[PDB]
Design a protein around this ligand. Structure first.
Ligand SMILES: Nc1ncnc2c1ncn2[C@@H]1O[C@H](COP(=O)(O)O)[C@@H](O)[C@H]1O
Length: 128
């Protein structure tokens, strides 16, 4: 199980960080259990947390919400997009779709239970 409250960066890793591609239905059961509903969609970045956190130190750019703490990866990355096809919670079923895209993440200061990097990724801002 996960604690009563994880940090935003830790939830970002649980939700979007799977360096090895896996099965959607398998990898979604944890997230849907923490949310108590079948998540309609989620993107898995096939990269190490160390790699995605390193994007936080590249040039800061604008986000969708017009905040300015977003950073774009310098290179495309492998991804799998899970899509809720059927099933009632907790029996959520998904279809997988591979992608090779750039990503933009929003970063913020580490919270006191996160690793002490200058910045940590907390939100998958966009795929492009
Ligand atoms: N543009 C943004 N800049 C900074 N933090 C954000 C941004 N969008 C979402 N967040 C944070 O990311 C968390 C949720 O992200 P997510 O679950 O990926 O939607 C919350 O703690 C938000 O405050």
């Amino acid at each position: 199980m996960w604690p009563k409250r994880l940090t935003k960066a830790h939830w970002f890793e649980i939700q979007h960080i799977q360096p090895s591609p896996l099965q959607c239905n398998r990898a979604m059961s944890g997230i849907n259990n923490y949310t108590q509903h079948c998540k309609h969609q989620n993107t898995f970045l096939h990269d190490s947390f160390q790699n995605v956190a390193a994007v936080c130190d590249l040039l800061s750019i604008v986000c969708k919400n017009r905040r300015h703490n977003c950073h774009q990866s310098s290179k495309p990355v492998n991804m799998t997009d899970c899509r809720l096809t059927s099933g009632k919670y907790p029996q959520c079923r998904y279809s997988a779709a591979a992608q090779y895209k750039f990503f933009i993440v929003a970063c913020d200061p580490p919270q006191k239970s996160d690793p002490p990097y200058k910045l940590v990724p907390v939100h998958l801002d966009s795929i492009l």
